[PDB]
Amino acid sequence: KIRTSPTFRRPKTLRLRRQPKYPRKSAPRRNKLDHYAIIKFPLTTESAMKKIEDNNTLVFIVDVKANKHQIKQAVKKLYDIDVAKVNTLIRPDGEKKAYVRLAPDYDALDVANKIGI
Amino acid sequence: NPLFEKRPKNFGIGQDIQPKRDLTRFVKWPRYIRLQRQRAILYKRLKVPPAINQFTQALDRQTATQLLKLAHKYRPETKQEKKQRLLARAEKKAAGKGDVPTKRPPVLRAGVNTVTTLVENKKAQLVVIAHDVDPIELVVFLPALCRKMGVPYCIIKGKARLGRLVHRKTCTTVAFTQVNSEDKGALAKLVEAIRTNYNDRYDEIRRHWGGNVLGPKSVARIAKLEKAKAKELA
Amino acid sequence: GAYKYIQELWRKKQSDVMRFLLRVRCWQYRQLSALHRAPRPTRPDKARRLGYKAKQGYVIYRIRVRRG
Amino acid sequence: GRVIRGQRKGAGSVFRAHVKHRKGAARLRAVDFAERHGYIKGIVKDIIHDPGRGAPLAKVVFRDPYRFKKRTELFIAAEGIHTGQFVYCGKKAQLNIGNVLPVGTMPEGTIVCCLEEKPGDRGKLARASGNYATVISHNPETKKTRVKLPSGSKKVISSANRAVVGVVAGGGRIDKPILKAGRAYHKYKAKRNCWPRVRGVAMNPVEHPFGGGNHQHIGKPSTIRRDAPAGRKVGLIAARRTGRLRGTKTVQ
RNA sequence: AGCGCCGUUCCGAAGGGACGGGCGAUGGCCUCCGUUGCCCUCGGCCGAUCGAAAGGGAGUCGGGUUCAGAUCCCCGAAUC
RNA sequence: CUGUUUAAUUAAAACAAAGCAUCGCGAAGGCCCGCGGCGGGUGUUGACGCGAUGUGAUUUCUGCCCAGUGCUCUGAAUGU
RNA sequence: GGCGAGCCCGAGGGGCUCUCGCUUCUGGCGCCAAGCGCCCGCCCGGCCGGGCGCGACCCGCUCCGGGGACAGUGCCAGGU
Ligand SMILES: [Mg+2]
Ligand SMILES: [Mg+2]
Ligand SMILES: [Mg+2]
Ligand SMILES: [Mg+2]
Ligand SMILES: [Mg+2]
Ligand SMILES: [Mg+2]
Ligand SMILES: [Mg+2]
Ligand SMILES: [Mg+2]
Ligand SMILES: [Mg+2]
Ligand SMILES: [Mg+2]
Ligand SMILES: [Mg+2]
Ligand SMILES: [Mg+2]
Ligand SMILES: [Mg+2]
Ligand SMILES: [Mg+2]
Ligand SMILES: [Mg+2]
Ligand SMILES: [Mg+2]
Ligand SMILES: [Mg+2]
Ligand SMILES: [Mg+2]
């Protein structure tokens, strides 16, 4: 060893990967936010209803924890229809209002008739 | 052979850059490094008292190796061989139904309390004292005490080197009280040279003040001024 | 057997053998930090008569305070 | 009473130096192998106006003999250098304007500026605009040297410390009257909050030890000793004389 | 004494990164790629982090649309 | 002179102000803050500077007093 | 170390005593070693691929300087 630099620093030493002897919360904390708990309501106001005919677009009320990718997955995994894109806003009462544009193949009127509204 | 020129560099001041030199003496060491180095230099600068300058005056390497060849075979039993002697002695006494098959084990005592008791009651033949005891108050009574009680003592370098014969890290002291048949002449041969070194020269050693050694730069400066004094006189 | 000699050598602490060790240790402890962990006591008997039995779990701190 | 105007400077709430727009502290090279055993070349890149400083500030670039890299330092611009003049610094460096070199090389009568008190603190003495120290009376053994400071103090210093040769550029700066309040306002707005100095006579008795009373008069002797505590040292501070001057100063 | 205070480089072993090379291991189409461990070489940090809905900061504009939106919805054309 | 002030009674002859002087200090320093550490501020500064006062453009002038009261220098000079 | 000058004896030589040295017209460029010399797997006396020392002197107890048993800090005492 011929120590060139005037500064003396630490040697890069060995740091162990953590390998515990027991799990520390007994279980995976289960996902409370699954697909039936993401999407609360469909919405039957007249302004939201007008978008169904005129824009091929559905309106839902979502809990505020869920983001746009999870809404885009949940609408597919419940209603078996594609998602063009998703706009969201926070409705000033407190919930999240999510507009979901469907694919051009599908029909918002048929999906409204088959979810009941 | 065709092109293959020499391209020398010139490492003068004000031109082509310096290469990487050794830089051992100039690296900014951390705190504990500088502490132990200034600790050694502070021992060398100050006037150490004669009770503790006795250490750094110790037994040489050849006689230390001969003493260790003596003490290597008086090894106290560590856990495996103590377990072996206990279980095997219990098995043989349970088989042969004997009372006292164990004749005499001669073994060396260690530890400062176990040494000092034997030196007070005059059982010790030879006291081995380690050099490197960092609280020196743990030792500094022992040379004058062994001097009064007549037991010869030898200062040997390396307190870890006493640990490898006692199956432990630090040992600080080794007592010799009891010898075998063959080892008596070797032990007396050791005790003669040890009494020549330590005990009979105790009144000599007790008045030496060790250390008081100035820094070599300052010693070189005073010696250069002494040559200047020689230039003034002659 | 020997802790009596330890205690008596530490007892008359103004003599010339001990005050050198005391001065070296004062410089040594001043150059370090304010609170740290010594691996082993520097007064073994005096720490032992306060309850230090050298086994697994008895820690020795060295600590520094300002006078006045 | 209330705290006087003098004691608020120690707080540093609104009396710090307005230190944003400044470029850097004007230091010499930290002394190393080359400046003690030879000389090393340097280019001045430019000079700039260091704000709050009357001296112009030169930006001299150096070559670093250890790492393949150019280093940039900030010297006080000696009078008469210009962008493209080489600056030579080191022990045996030749003596011209701008060449910072130790005082042991220069003969007595040399007129320098921007020197070190103790060898290796990168310039303390004689740094203001238009000033110079003067080097006299070398002792060969026990390397010390007398210098005249711009006040008149004759100081003995070590001979291993370094100084740039010439005068600090920007002399004659006090030759123009500021002549209106606004330019003084811009000057002290560049430096620090110390303008509108109220006459400790004019201010009120809980605010200064002088003022108050029906007339604007002090009423106390205006020379106050140095053993006097804080808040008291107003007016003349331990004046060994007063009145209008006479002689030169003649203080030994 | 103390909740703590001072302090922002000062009295600190304050980088867990990469280039190639070598030894070794694992896995995929074990062709050959992809990981991981060790070692060598290199690497000023003028210091964590915070601080601007007017400073710095890549990239969207036009037409139409509602009882309430608009450079966001639609139509069409672009760009990072 | 321009400027500023007692917001909720004063706008001035007051205040500052450039100019004129005066004093401390060569960094182990001055003048300050701080309960504390050689902790801060002036200072990323160094006598054409920092700090503390007086007077108040220019023009012409700055007389006389060290008794009092301060301030300062000096010497174990010699009383306390 | 003489490309050196010295101050001597001196036929060369001695080191008596040393001085330090490889950049001063110019807004350039400079790193990650050329060369040397040993050792390996590699081709019948050869070819390819690696390593180590000299280049860059050795030893030594503080990083280098400047102060220093003072200044400073703790307590006590007297002036202010
Ligand atoms: Mg332990
Ligand atoms: Mg004024
Ligand atoms: Mg005024
Ligand atoms: Mg008033
Ligand atoms: Mg008052
Ligand atoms: Mg009157
Ligand atoms: Mg931010
Ligand atoms: Mg903005
Ligand atoms: Mg439009
Ligand atoms: Mg609107
Ligand atoms: Mg105001
Ligand atoms: Mg009014
Ligand atoms: Mg200061
Ligand atoms: Mg006038
Ligand atoms: Mg008068
Ligand atoms: Mg008098
Ligand atoms: Mg020193
Ligand atoms: Mg001295």
CA dist D149 and D129 (Å) reads 14
- Contacts (Cβ under 8 Å, ≥6 apart) of B215: B41, B45
Q: Which of B43, B35, B48, B179 is nearest to B106 (CA)?
A: B179
Query: Is the backbone of residue D14 left (phi > 0), alpha (psi -120 to 50) or beta?
Result: alpha
Phi/psi at D47 (nearest 5 deg)? Answer: -125, 150
Disruptive mutation site among C7, C13, C19, C21 for chain B (greatest number of B CBs within 10 Å): C21
Please give the structure tokens belonging to residue B100: 């006292």
How distant, in Å, are the alpha carbons of A69, A75, D4, D10, D240 from that of D209? Answer: 75, 82, 8, 19, 21
Q: Which residues surround ligand 5, an ion (CB under 5 A)?
A: D 1, 209
Q: B219 in helix, strand or coil?
A: helix
Q: CA-to-C1' distance for D62 and F71, Å? A: 54
**Can you tell me which residue has the tokens 């009127």?**
A109
Give first-to-last CA distance, chain B, whole Å: 62
Q: How do strand A57-62 and strand A39-42 relate by DSSP bridges?
A: antiparallel
Name the closest ligand to CA D214.
Answer: 4
Query: Is the backbone of residue A78 left (phi > 0), alpha (psi -120 to 50) or beta?
Result: alpha
Is B27 close to A2, i.e. CB distance below 8 A? no
Q: CA-to-C1' distance for A2 and E18, Å? A: 23
- In this complex, which of A2, A4, A7 lies closest to B28 when CB atoms are compared? A7
CA dist A11 and A5 (Å) reads 14
Q: CA-to-C1' distance for D224 and F30, Å? A: 15
Q: C31 in helix, strand or coil?
A: helix
Phi/psi at B82 (nearest 5 deg)? Answer: -65, -45
- C61 to chain B, any CB pair closer than 8 A? The answer is no
- Concatenate the DSSP letters of all residues of B82-120 into one string: HHHHHHHHHHHHHHH--S---------EESHHHHHHHHH
Determine whether D224 is exposed, middle or buried from the number of CB atoms within 10 Å of its CB (0-12, 13-18, 19+): middle
CA dist D194 and A113 (Å) reads 81
CA dist B152 and B175 (Å) reads 11
Cβ proximity of D106 and D133 under 8 Å: no
The sign of the CA dihedral D211, D217, D219, D220 is positive
In strand G, which positions have an atom below 7 A from any protein CB?
A: 18, 21-28, 30-36, 55-56, 60-67, 73-75, 79-80
Phi/psi at D61 (nearest 5 deg)? Answer: -100, 145
- Rg value, chain A, Cα: 25
Please give the structure tokens belonging to residue A94: 């407190």
Phi/psi at D164 (nearest 5 deg)? Answer: -90, 150
**3+ Cβ–Cβ pairs closer than 8 Å linking B and C:** yes
- For B130, the enclosing helix (H) or strand (E) is strand B126-130
CA dist B191 and B128 (Å) reads 11
- Which of A 62-91 have CB under 7 A of nucleic chain E? 85, 87
Count CB neighbours of B77 within 10 A.
14
Is A2 close to B20, i.e. CB distance below 8 A? yes
Disruptive mutation site among B9, B10, B11, B13 for chain D (greatest number of D CBs within 10 Å): B13
* Residue B18 with chain D: CB contacts under 8 Å: 65-66
CA–centroid distance, B27 to ligand 12, in Å, is: 75
- In this complex, which of B42, B49, B116 lies closest to C2 when CB atoms are compared? B116
- For B176, the enclosing helix (H) or strand (E) is strand B173-176
Phi/psi at B186 (nearest 5 deg)? Answer: -70, -35
Is D37 close to B18, i.e. CB distance below 8 A? no
Sheet holding A39-42, edge to edge: A39-42, A57-62, A96-101, A85-90
Helix, strand, coil percentages (3-state) for chain B, rounded to 5, are 45, 10, 50
Residues counted in chain C: 68
CA dist B67 and B58 (Å) reads 13
How distant, in Å, are the alpha carbons of B76, B85, B87, B92, B98 from that of B82? Answer: 9, 5, 9, 15, 20
Count CB neighbours of D117 within 10 A.
13
Cβ proximity of C35 and C64 under 8 Å: yes
Disruptive mutation site among A3, A9, A10 for chain B (greatest number of B CBs within 10 Å): A3
Is C44 close to B31, i.e. CB distance below 8 A? no
Q: CA-to-C1' distance for D176 and F66, Å? A: 40
Phi/psi at B176 (nearest 5 deg)? Answer: -115, 120
Phi/psi at B62 (nearest 5 deg)? Answer: -65, -50
**Can you tell me which residue has the tokens 């005790």?**
B191
Q: B178 in helix, strand or coil?
A: coil
- B30 to chain A, any CB pair closer than 8 A? The answer is yes
* Closest Cα in chain A to B30: A8
Q: What's the number of CA atoms in the CB half-sphere (13 Å) around residue B154? A: 28
Give first-to-last CA distance, chain D, whole Å: 41
- For C35, the enclosing helix (H) or strand (E) is strand C35-38
* Residue B22 with chain A: CB contacts under 8 Å: 2-3
- Concatenate the DSSP letters of all residues of B21-35 into one string: ---TTTSB--HHHHH
Cβ proximity of A68 and A86 under 8 Å: yes
Q: B194 in helix, strand or coil?
A: helix
Q: How do strand D236-237 and strand B173-176 relate by DSSP bridges?
A: unpaired
Give first-to-last CA distance, chain A, whole Å: 80
Cβ proximity of D146 and D154 under 8 Å: yes
Count CB neighbours of B153 within 10 A.
24
- Concatenate the DSSP letters of all residues of chain D into one string: -PPPSSGGGGT-SS-S---SS-------PPP-HHHHHSEEEEEEEEEEE-TT-SSEEEEEEEE-SSSSSEEEEEEE-BTT--TT-EEEEETT---STT--EETTTSPTT-EEEEE-SSTTSS--BS-STT--EEEEEEETTTTEEEEE-SSS-EEEEESS-EEEES-BS-TTGGGS---SHHHHHHHHHHH-S------TTTS-TTT-SS--TTTT---S-SEE-SSS-TTT--SEES-S--SS--SS----
CA–centroid distance, C39 to ligand 1, in Å, is: 6
Q: Which of B128, B120, B123 is nearest to B179 (CA)?
A: B123
**Residue D98 corresponds to which amino acid?**
G
b vs e for D125-134, b when ≥16 Cβ sit within 10 Å of the residue's Cβ? bbebbbbbbb
- DSSP label at B77? P
Q: Which of D141, D133, D86, D144 is nearest to D110 (CA)?
A: D133
Residue D63 C-alpha, separation from nearest chain B C-alpha, in angstroms = 9
* Closest Cα in chain B to D39: B14
In strand F, which positions have an atom below 7 A from any protein CB?
A: 1-2, 14-28, 30-34, 40-56, 62, 66, 69-73
Cβ proximity of A71 and A86 under 8 Å: yes
Interface of B with C in 173-192 (CB under 8 A): none
- Concatenate the DSSP letters of all residues of C44-65 into one string: HHHHHTTT---STT--EEEE--
Cβ proximity of D44 and D59 under 8 Å: yes
Q: What's the number of CA atoms in the CB half-sphere (13 Å) around residue D136? A: 10
Interface of D with B in 1-40 (CB under 8 A): 33-34, 37-40
- B135 to chain D, any CB pair closer than 8 A? The answer is no
How distant, in Å, are the alpha carbons of A60, B80, B103 from that of B94? Answer: 90, 21, 17
Strand partners, D41: D88
Sheet holding B126-130, edge to edge: B109-110, B173-176, B126-130, B153-156
- DSSP label at B4? -
Cβ proximity of D144 and D119 under 8 Å: no
Disruptive mutation site among D29, D66, D92, D141 for chain B (greatest number of B CBs within 10 Å): D66
Cβ proximity of D156 and D144 under 8 Å: yes
CA dist D63 and D66 (Å) reads 9
- Rg value, chain D, Cα: 23
Cβ proximity of D70 and D40 under 8 Å: no
Please give the structure tokens belonging to residue D45: 């890149």
Is D34 close to B18, i.e. CB distance below 8 A? no
* Closest Cα in chain B to C41: B135
- For B153, the enclosing helix (H) or strand (E) is strand B153-156
**Can you tell me which residue has the tokens 């106001």?**
A45
Resolution of the entry in angstroms: 3.4
- In this complex, which of B14, B17, B18 lies closest to D38 when CB atoms are compared? B14
- B120 to chain C, any CB pair closer than 8 A? The answer is yes
CA dist D146 and D133 (Å) reads 10
Q: Which residues surround ligand 3, an ion (CB under 5 A)?
A: D 199
Q: Which of D92, D70, D96, D69 is nearest to D81 (CA)?
A: D96
- Contacts (Cβ under 8 Å, ≥6 apart) of C13: C19, C22
Q: B162 in helix, strand or coil?
A: coil
Residue D65 C-alpha, separation from nearest chain B C-alpha, in angstroms = 5
Hey, which chains touch A, using 3+ CB pairs under 8 Å?
Answer: B
Is A6 close to B26, i.e. CB distance below 8 A? yes
Phi/psi at D239 (nearest 5 deg)? Answer: -75, 120
Cβ proximity of A47 and A97 under 8 Å: no
CA dist A92 and A99 (Å) reads 16
Q: CA-to-C1' distance for D220 and F67, Å? A: 19
Determine whether A91 is exposed, middle or buried from the number of CB atoms within 10 Å of its CB (0-12, 13-18, 19+): middle
Strand partners, D111: D134
- Concatenate the DSSP letters of all residues of chain A into one string: ----SSB--------PPP--SS-SSSS----S--HHHHEEEE---HHHHHHHHHHSEEEEEE-TT--HHHHHHHHHHHH----SEEEEEE-TTSSEEEEEEPPSSS-HHHHHHHH--
